[PDB]
DNA sequence: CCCTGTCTGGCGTCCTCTCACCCCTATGATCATGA
DNA sequence: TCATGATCATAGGCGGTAGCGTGCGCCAGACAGGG
């Protein structure tokens, strides 16, 4: 509503302002009612799909795990490496960039001292053993799960983790809701990923790919900015270079799909017959 | 998906304690399917120890004596 | 079931079986005295439709009813869904040695103990008191002990303080969402009629004190007392299983 | 029971208010044209017995 | 001037807006609707006469007999309300009907009947309504609740977005009849037009247009315009109106008059349309490709061959033009089928049609109705005339015809109840217009489309259904019997009518049990707009939008009083000023603001008349004439608030209390509470309980007297006068002479209702509040009821509260209460439980109620008399014997284990024939003696009033000052006096006196008959003994108290007096709340209520100080006048100079416990007025006193807030919820414990608790939690032996309910087993 | 046979507390009263 | 002594010479329509 409520609860509220407040309040109450109605059924389906998975061995004996990197939406780093690789057994043994020097062995539970020693050396991506890549027939081994959450040590042989997992996912379901360019902030080296780029006549670096992802590598190894770069975007910089803060390095058109080229030559028409393939539509009020 | 992954089990008592019981019992009836109590909820049904906590040690003893 | 009015409002199953047996006896009599050529057919259609009303009512076209709009209950309506044997009687049961009342604060508690009334502690813990009476020799049989604890004489409160002492109970809030919703305490007898519950613990139950009600259960056997002391005690669960955050945050 | 009448011009719901009405011999959706086997080739019977059923 | 009970305790009133329309009688929906239902109503409608004139005359199956209708009449009920609630009968009245039978002759139904017969007939019993607005169905007082449902008429909804997954919206047009078959027109993504009837199979829509006997040429004449092609010498020229060409790109160069107008490749502009219509261009030239796809309208036939050239609704090709061109046709009529303007929806619909004439359409409609049967032309005509076009099976009401004419832009709002051809054609025209882009769809939740049924209309409909069943019986019997020998009571029987109306009032979804524990709860349960029930939506299905407040609930339905939980916004409560329109919609008052001046006439607006006009907000400032003092004023135009000019307004609201209901207008400072907390406060104010001595609200809203008087718990005076005899039982008013009838001399007797059971087991008492010799005015309280005081409304009590954290005992929401509260016996509520005991009839013989009882001794039988029934007054414990009963085996009634009480009332009912024992004869003699004394006192008191009238008449005209009392008093007529009005009046009083004599004789004989007779009872019961225990429940840790703003709380510790924080005067505070509930739960109104309550008590303490010192009335007059002026421009303006020195002392006697203050809802007391009233008392300005501690005796830092808050005890007590079970009874089918508290049961260890024990490693706890403790019977007997012998050990076994699962699966064709 | 629309089956929170309601109507047989 | 009328007790599944139903919604998988 374009005319806001200019009155607080210490002063009065007249009749219309209190009526608009009632719109908001009853919308919230009906949200909470039907929200609980969906949340309980979500907890039911999750504890009935898990239901059975018991920590039934002590070492599966594989290596392939998932790669834990800090998540980067394109602003501040939302979830750091300490809060993701806290207490989970490493897949491949992490070597510090003093290559052929082992920092952690390949079956070490990463508790808080090890996570601080990960944060000091600025470790890129601690590849770690996940439950989904296990090898235990009819159950899940103990090392691929991790720390016993709610306790300190490794998981005991036996605790039913499917049920505590399904309750931990469905329990905050009561709280949930129901119904142009690239601007940099920090400073560091510039990384490009999955790019097919070429040089324009202006001397810049233009792109011939939709799958281009720009990254900002910081001073110690990790990444603090990531940007999906569109098709045919124009960079003011290149790969491996150095920028400063507040410097927009890319620009494109979100309305137009550019069909930019690679080689320099004349333009001709092939299989373009007028009247059928191309039509004659004169732009009336502009001219071109 | 989790409701289809839970209805598609090798144990008809779990898939009967979940959603539609008619389809699960008819498919397990004509197939001659044979549950072996396989985990937590069938043992909650039948009235014996869960194979999770202390009943996990009991089930290792029972399976070792098989 | 009798309704104490001289009549039997019958269950739906006896109505269904009675319909099948009526229709089947009439079909036996009509096959007996010869069917009029293209006639021994309507009665078999009626029998097939009555059996299809008995095995799963409402799956075939329009269901039957006794009174008045509500369709009555077949066998598949006793196995399926809610109000059926899988979800109402076999996965969650009604349980002896249990009670329930309204909760309150009482901040003089240590966090492994809760207040619990003298009347609830006397009615939950009856056979323990019977055993202590005929083990100390204050009643010959079980009936004298029952009449002693019905009269509530002056000695059974000492018996009750000697049976509560190291014996946990399970407190339970009614919408149990996560596994911290069932915890185990060591009771303290309270003059009154409410359950005094430690305040910090109410961060885990999501329980205020505006009329909330909690239910107490008793572990009978010995292994269940050890599981409600070593696994489920209120001092052990100080960390949540969703993360590493403490659940004893002062509110 | 065997009754002689004519379907279309005299529509049934008008005549519904009386007995004689559970419904036609069908074996199918349509009211089945019945044979009159007793009337045509089986007039006089019941030599089964007069058992007076049970 | 003030009424005499308004000079007792005149409530201080803030408030600024001078009222113009007082609060109406709050129970007018129930009483006005049921008065509309049952009353002798001429000119047909509404009422019972509508049913009796729409279902009658029943004419037979061509037997020339006819049962027509004359009139009806209801006799008096055999039982009045009190005997009806005591015994247990319906409160019904017999419905006598005068029916007539006529029997026509042969060959002339337009000829003379040979014989008629008109007679009285009995049918049904309709239950009457009591004056409170409630029904008494089986001794239990029930309320039928108003339903909110869809208004009959057309309704153009739009199935937006969701269908076909391509964004193409649909449009449907549901015709909603009041009674009959529905009719839904709609579209489909192929842009065809589809009808359907009662959600059945789907047909193309124009199949019904052929069913109304339209040829296809006429259909295209209706639904399209015409395009004329004239073959005039050159290329088949065209008549052209360029308005069709608005934006169309032509295929050639349009030229005329030798001038190029339109070029090929361009579109026709609007100025080119202006050129062509200015030059008046008529005939233009088309190519051969222009009529390549033009659709012909009507059939062209060739005159030579007699064949068909081209069929109707067909596109034209080259050969069709070649055929019709050489046949002699120069005019060609086609249709205009544009992209935006007019789609060919009718044309595509007729191309999908297989039908061709009226007969095939009627056959297809008869086949979609009843599937698979031979149609016949007579049967198809009869069905389609009985779907929409018959007075029997189809009936829009007047509401339906109004909406159907209004939503089609008609003029007359009067029409027939049946449809016609023009109606369906206008529905299809408006649907095509909505599809074309002009006009709008109609929303559902708009209150111009939600009608309100009530008690009268729903009882009429159920009675009509009973009548169509009985016309289905009378049509059976009338032409299948011998005539003339029968009478019209042998035909019609009262079983279906009484069964239908008794099933509706007995068990419906809207005839619900009255929540009666409070006058507020009565008067807000009777005003309820429920959306549920028959014809409305359901809770577990719908939805989102109907649970939301629409912008047109403003002043009709309350926005903040609704039950939270599974049905929010469906159990809406109707507002204060909201009446009900003539048709059934909602309407609300406004003030007609003529061009400058707010005129004080009220003027009722409906929900759709409000939208067109523009309404000023309620609290807009105006300077003594009506001129709006601003030049921008906040208003609302069409459901949307804005800021308008000074004199473009058309209406102003009446009073500022009209958005809210009466549940949430007794909340002071409502404008300061957030709406969630106001909702919870209104709902808990409904859930209160009456205390022992209800006090008053110090901070009210002035709305208490409307809720108290306009309900039915107080004893309002009918005719004013002088009180003669006050007693705790009765009150006698002597009627003043300027209010009094000439005959029936008249002094009124009010028999109060003493201690009796309510529905919620409270104690509905009435206490007399008038003195003796006291004047009372017409319309005034005499006896306070439950939770009333001097005619006000006192729900809870007002106590001294402080906001401070006190050592943790008020942690989340808890409340901490001093022992000074429980010592004063001020929340000590009184409850009454009814315990019944029947003497059934079984085998080996009947039962015994006598006290010769086995297995018992002196200690049980000392509290019974010599005939089994407990005494009246014997204070029993939990588990004694009340009624001793033995069967051919002790089965005596016992007090259920836990409750104390005092037996206050014993009823004994005896089925007639059974021997009355000695106590039943004692109760019979007792009630004979009571009724004898009561009717004799009626005769004596009314004879005393009659003799006082004789003395008042004989003051003049032959007065005898000494001779009047020498003779006996019954002869005061033959004294010396001529033929005047006085001897005429003495003759009229002699007529009245002899009438009272013979009436007393016959009524005492009838009352002895009513006491002496038996009562019809259950099948096979001897006698019913009912005993009323009267528990007195005080307060304890665990009860629930709450204020009036949503501040709930379990009282957690009942402290001693000494521990309370006291101040530097000495007084301890009573209750210590918790401050932390205020900034999160935003109910800031309770702190303003606290400060204004402390101001009120400061004025009360100063009155108590000025009166305890025995001061003369001058200083009291001074101080009371200063406390009653005190404000801005207010409404009260009292002066004590017309109270005359004796009322001021009694007004100060009523003000010494505090001064009551009214604070209306949105026009309340501001902050500066509270400060100025706290300055009148010597209290601190900020409201905060420094408080010492009780334990340490040293001061709390940072001074705390004290005051008075008016707190309510709720009836969620703690010795009604607490329960415990070791080992009780077990269920029968599955060997598990029973459920509930009355059944001694165990708590459900539900499914999520099983998950929470799987989530730990607790395995033995769960095994005994679902095998030993619950189900396995041998397991639990082994467990009980092992527990009483000290061996904690379980033998597990199997759940028996799993064996029940095996038997239920095995009872199918399924073979489940257990292997190994 | 390869889509693409329709149809009909599934499913829609937990725990507790309270209250009412749970055939009436028609036909046949027996008894009493009146002629 | 016989006949008639009235009252009381005992006994079954839309009620009627049709029509009642009408305010959930999503997903999903089979059955079939159109081409
Ligand atoms: Mg709460
Ligand atoms: Zn593994």
UniProtKB/TrEMBL annotation, chain D:
It comes from the Bacteria. Interacts with both the nontemplate DNA and the RNA polymerase (RNAP). Belongs to the RfaH family. Enhances distal genes transcription elongation in a specialized subset of operons that encode extracytoplasmic components. RfaH is recruited into a multi-component RNA polymerase complex by the ops element, which is a short conserved DNA sequence located downstream of the main promoter of these operons. Once bound, RfaH suppresses pausing and inhibits Rho-dependent and intrinsic termination at a subset of sites. Termination signals are bypassed, which allows complete synthesis of long RNA chains. This is Transcription antitermination protein RfaH. It comes from Escherichia coli. The lineage of its organism: Bacteria, Pseudomonadati, Pseudomonadota, Gammaproteobacteria, Enterobacterales. The gene is rfaH. The chain holds residues 55 to 108 of 162 of the full protein.
């Amino acid at each position: 509503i374009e005319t806001p409520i200019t009155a607080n609860f210490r002063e009065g509220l007249n009749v219309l302002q209190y009526f608009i407040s009632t719109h908001g309040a009853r919308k919230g109450l009906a949200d909470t009612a039907l929200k609980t109605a969906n949340s309980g059924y979500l907890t039911r389906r999750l504890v009935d799909v898990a239901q059975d998975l018991v920590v039934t061995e002590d070492d599966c004996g594989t290596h392939e795990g998932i790669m834990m990197t800090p998540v980067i939406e394109g602003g501040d780093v939302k979830e750091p490496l300490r809060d993701r690789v806290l207490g989970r057994v490493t897949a491949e043994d992490v070597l510090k960039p003093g290559t052929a020097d082992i920092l952690v062995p390949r079956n070490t539970l990463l508790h808080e001292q090890w996570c601080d020693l990960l944060e000091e050396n600025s470790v890129d991506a601690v590849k770690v053993r996940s439950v989904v890549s296990c090898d235990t027939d009819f159950g899940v081994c103990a090392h691929c799960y991790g720390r016993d959450l709610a306790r300190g040590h490794i998981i005991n042989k036996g605790e039913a983790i499917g049920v505590i997992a399904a309750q931990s996912i469905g329990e905050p379901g009561t709280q949930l809701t129901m119904r142009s360019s690239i601007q940099v902030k920090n400073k560091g080296s510039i990384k490009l990923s999955n790019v097919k780029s070429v040089v324009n006549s202006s001397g810049k670096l233009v792109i011939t790919s939709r799958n281009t992802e720009l990254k900002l590598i910081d001073e110690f190894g990790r990444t603090k900015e990531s940007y999906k770069v569109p098709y045919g975007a124009v960079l003011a910089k290149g790969d491996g270079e150095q920028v400063a803060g507040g410097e927009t390095v890319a620009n494109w058109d979100p309305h137009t799909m550019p069909v930019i080229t690679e080689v320099s030559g004349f333009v001709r028409f092939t299989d373009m017959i007028d009247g059928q393939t191309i039509t004659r539509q004169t732009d009336e009020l502009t001219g071109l | 998906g989790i409701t289809k992954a839970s209805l598609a089990t090798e144990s008809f008592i779990s898939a009967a304690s979940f959603q539609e019981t008619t389809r699960v019992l008819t498919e397990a009836a004509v197939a001659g399917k044979r549950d072996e109590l396989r985990g937590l909820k069938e043992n909650v049904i039948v009235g014996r120890l869960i194979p999770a906590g202390t009943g996990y040690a009991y089930h290792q003893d029972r399976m070792r004596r098989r | 079931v009798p309704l104490d009015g001289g009549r039997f409002a019958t269950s739906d199953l006896n109505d269904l079986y009675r319909r099948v047996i009526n229709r089947n006896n009439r079909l036996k009599r009509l096959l007996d005295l010869a069917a009029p050529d293209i006639i021994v057919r309507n009665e078999k259609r009626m029998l097939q439709e009555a059996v299809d009303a008995l095995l799963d009512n409402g799956r075939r076209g329009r269901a039957i009813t006794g009174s008045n709009k509500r369709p009555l209950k077949s066998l598949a309506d006793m196995i399926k869904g809610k109000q059926g044997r899988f979800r109402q009687n076999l996965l969650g049961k009604r349980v002896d040695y249990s009670g329930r009342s309204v909760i309150t604060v009482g901040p003089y508690l240590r966090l492994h103990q809760c207040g619990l009334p003298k009347k609830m502690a006397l009615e939950l813990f009856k056979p323990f008191i019977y055993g202590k009476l005929e083990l100390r020799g204050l009643a010959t049989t079980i009936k004298a002990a029952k009449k002693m604890v019905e009269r509530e004489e002056a000695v059974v409160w000492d018996i009750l303080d000697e049976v509560i002492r190291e014996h946990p109970v399970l407190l339970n809030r009614a919408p149990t969402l996560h596994r911290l919703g069932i915890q185990a305490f060591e009771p303290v007898l309270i003059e009154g009629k409410a359950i005094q519950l430690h305040p910090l613990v109410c961060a885990a139950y999501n329980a205020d004190f505006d009329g909330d009600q909690m239910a107490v259960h008793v572990p009978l056997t010995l292994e269940a007392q050890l599981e409600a002391r070593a696994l489920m005690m209120s001092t052990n669960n100080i960390l949540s299983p969703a993360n590493g955050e403490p659940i004893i945050v002062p509110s | 029971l065997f009754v002689e009448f004519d379907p279309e011009v005299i529509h049934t719901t008008t005549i519904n208010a009386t007995r004689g009405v559970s419904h036609f011999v069908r074996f199918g959706a349509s009211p089945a044209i019945v044979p009159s086997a007793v009337i045509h080739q089986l007039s006089v019977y019941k030599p089964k017995d007069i058992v007076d059923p049970a | 001037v003030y009424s005499y009970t308004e000079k007792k305790r005149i409530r201080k009133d803030f408030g600024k807006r001078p009222q113009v329309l007082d609060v109406p009688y709050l129970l007018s929906i129930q009483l006005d609707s049921f008065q509309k239902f049952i009353e002798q109503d001429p000119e047909g409608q509404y009422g019972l006469e509508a049913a009796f004139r729409s279902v009658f005359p029943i004419q037979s199956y061509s037997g020339n007999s006819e049962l027509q209708y004359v009139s009806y009449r209801l006799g008096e009920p055999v039982f009045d309300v009190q005997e009806c609630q005591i015994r247990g009968v319906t409160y019904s009245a017999p419905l006598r009907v005068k029916l007539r039978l006529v029997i026509y002759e042969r060959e002339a139904p337009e000829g003379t009947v040979k014989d008629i017969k008109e007679q009285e007939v009995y049918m049904g019993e309709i239950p009457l309504m009591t004056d409170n607005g409630t029904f008494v169905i089986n001794g239990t007082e029930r309320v039928i609740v108003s339903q909110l449902h869809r208004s009959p008429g057309v309704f153009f909804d739009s199935d937006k977005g969701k269908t076909h997954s391509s964004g193409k919206v649909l449009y449907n047009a549901r015709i909603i009849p009041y009674r009959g078959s529905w009719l839904d027109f709609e579209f489909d993504p192929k842009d065809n037009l589809f009808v359907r009837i009662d959600r059945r199979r789907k047909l193309p829509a124009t199949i019904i247009l052929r069913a109304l006997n339209y040829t296809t040429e006429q259909i295209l004449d209706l639904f399209f315009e015409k395009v004329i092609f004239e073959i005039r010498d050159n290329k088949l020229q065209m008549e052209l109106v360029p308005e069709r060409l608005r934006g169309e790109t032509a295929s050639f160069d349009i030229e005329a008059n030798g001038k190029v107008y339109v070029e090929k490749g361009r579109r026709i502009t609007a100025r080119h349309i202006r050129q062509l219509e200015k030059d008046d261009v008529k005939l233009i030239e088309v190519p051969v490709e222009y009529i390549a796809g033009k659709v012909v309208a009507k059939d062209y036939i060739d005159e030579s061959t007699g064949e068909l050239i081209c069929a109707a609704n067909m596109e034209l090709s080259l050969d069709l033009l070649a055929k019709l061109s050489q046949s002699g046709h120069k005019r060609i009529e086609t249709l205009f089928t544009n992209d935006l303007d007019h789609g060919p929806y009718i044309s595509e619909t007729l191309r999908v049609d297989p039908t061709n004439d009226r007969l095939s359409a009627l056959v297809e409609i008869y086949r979609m109705m009843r599937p698979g049967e031979p149609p016949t032309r007579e049967a198809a005509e009869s069905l389609f005339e009985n779907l929409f076009f018959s007075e029997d099976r189809y009936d829009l009401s007047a509401v339906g015809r109004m909406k159907f004419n209004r939503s089609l832009l008609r003029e007359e709002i009067e029409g027939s109840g049946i449809l016609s051809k023009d109606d369906i054609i206008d529905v299809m025209k408006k649907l095509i217009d909505i599809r074309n882009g002009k006009g709008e769809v109609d929303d559902i939740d708009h209150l111009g489309n939600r009608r309100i049924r009530s008690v009268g209309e729903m009882a009429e409909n159920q009675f009509r259904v009973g009548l169509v069943r009985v016309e289905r019986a009378v049509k059976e019997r009338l032409s299948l019997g011998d005539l003339d020998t029968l009478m019209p009571q042998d035909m019609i029987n009262a079983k279906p009518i009484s069964a239908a109306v008794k099933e509706f009032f007995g068990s419906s979804q809207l005839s619900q049990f009255m929540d009666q524990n409070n006058p507020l709860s009565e008067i807000t349960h009777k005003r309820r707009i429920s959306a549920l029930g028959p014809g409305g939506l359901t809770r577990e299905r719908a939805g989102f939008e109907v649970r939301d407040v629409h912008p047109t609930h403003y002043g009709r339905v309350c926005p903040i009083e609704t039950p939270e939980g599974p049905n929010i916004g469906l159990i809406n409560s109707l507002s204060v000023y909201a009446q009900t329109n003539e048709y059934g919609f909602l309407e609300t008052p406004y003030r007609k603001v003529t061009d400058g001046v707010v005129t004080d006439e009220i003027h009722y607006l409906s929900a759709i008349e409000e939208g067109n006009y523009v309404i000023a907000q309620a609290n807009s400032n105006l300077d003594e004439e009506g001129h709006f003092v601003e030049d921008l004023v906040t208003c609302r135009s069409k459901g949307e608030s804005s800021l308008f000019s000074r004199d473009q307004v058309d209406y102003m609201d009446v009073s500022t209390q009209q958005v809210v209901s009466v549940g949430a207008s007794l909340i002071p400072f409502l404008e300061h509470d957030d709406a969630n907390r106001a909702l919870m406060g209104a709902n808990m104010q409904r859930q209160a309980v009456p205390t022992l001595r209800a006090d008053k609200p110090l901070v009210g809203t002035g709305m208490e007297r409307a809720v108290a008087v306009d309900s039915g718990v107080t004893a309002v005076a009918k005719r004013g006068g002088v009180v003669q005899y006050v007693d705790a039982s009765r009150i006698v008013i002597k009627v003043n002479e300027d209010e009094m009838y000439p005959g029936e001399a008249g002094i009124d007797i009010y028999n109060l209702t003493k201690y009796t059971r309510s529905n919620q087991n409270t104690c509905i008492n009435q206490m007399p509040c008038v003195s003796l010799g006291e004047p009372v005015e017409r319309g005034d309280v005499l006896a306070d009821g439950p939770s009333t005081d001097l005619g006000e409304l006192a729900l809870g009590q007002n106590m001294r509260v402080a906001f401070m954290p006190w050592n943790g005992y008020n942690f989340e929401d808890s409340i901490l209460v001093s022992e000074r509260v429980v010592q004063e016996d001020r929340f000590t509520t009184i409850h009454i439980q009814e315990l019944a005991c029947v003497s059934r009839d079984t085998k080996l013989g009947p039962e015994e109620i006598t006290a010769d009882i086995p297995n018992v001794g002196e200690a049980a039988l000392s509290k019974l008399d010599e005939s089994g029934i407990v005494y009246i007054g014997a204070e029993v414990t939990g588990g004694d014997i009340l009624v001793g009963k033995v069967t051919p085996k002790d089965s005596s009634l016992r007090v259920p284990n836990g409750v104390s009480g005092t037996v206050i009332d014993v009823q004994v009912f005896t089925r007639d024939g059974v021997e009355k024992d000695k106590r039943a004869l004692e109760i019979e003699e007792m009630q004979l003696k009571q009724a004898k004394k009561d009717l004799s006192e009626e005769l004596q008191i009314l004879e005393a009033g009659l003799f006082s009238r004789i003395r008042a008449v004989l003051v003049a005209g032959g007065v005898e000052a000494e001779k009047l009392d020498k003779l006996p008093r019954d002869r005061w007529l033959e004294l010396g006096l001529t033929d005047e009005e006085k001897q005429n009046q003495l003759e009229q009083l002699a007529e009245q006196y002899d009438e009272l004599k013979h009436e007393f004789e016959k009524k005492l004989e009838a009352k002895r008959r009513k006491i002496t007779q038996g009562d019809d009872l259950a099948p096979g019961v001897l006698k019913i003994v009912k005993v009323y225990l009267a528990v007195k429940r005080r307060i304890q840790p665990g009860d629930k108290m709450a204020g009036r703003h949503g501040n709930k709380g379990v009282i957690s510790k009942i402290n001693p007096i000494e521990d309370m924080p006291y101040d530097e005067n000495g007084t301890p505070v009573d209750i210590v709340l918790n401050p932390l509930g205020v900034p999160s739960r935003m109910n800031i109104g309770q702190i303003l209520e606290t400060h204004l309550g402390m101001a009120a008590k400061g004025i009360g303490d100063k009155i108590n100080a000025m009166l305890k010192q025995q001061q003369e009335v001058a200083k009291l007059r001074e101080f009371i006048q200063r406390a009653y002026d005190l404000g801005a421009d207010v409404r009260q303006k009292v002066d004590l100079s017309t109270f005359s020195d004796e009322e001021v002392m009694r007004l100060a006697e009523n003000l010494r416990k505090g001064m009551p203050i009214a604070t209306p809802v949105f026009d309340g007391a501001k902050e500066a007025e509270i400060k100025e009233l706290l300055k009148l008392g010597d209290l601190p300005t900020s409201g905060q006193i420094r408080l010492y501690d009780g334990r340490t005796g040293e001061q709390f830092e940072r001074p705390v807030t004290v005051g008075y808050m008016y707190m309510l005890k709720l009836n969620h007590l703690v010795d009604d919820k607490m329960h415990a079970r070791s080992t009780g009874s077990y269920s029968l089918v599955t060997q598990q414990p029973l459920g509930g508290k009355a059944q001694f049961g165990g708590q459900r260890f539900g499914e999520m608790e099983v998950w929470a024990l799987e989530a730990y490693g607790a395995a033995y706890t769960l095994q005994e939690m679902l095998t030993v403790k619950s189900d396995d019977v041998n397991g639990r007997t082994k467990m009980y032996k092992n527990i009483v012998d000290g061996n904690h050990q379980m033998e597990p076994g199997m759940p028996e309910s799993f064996n029940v699962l095996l038997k239920e699966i095995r009872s199918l064709g399924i073979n489940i087993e257990l292997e190994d």
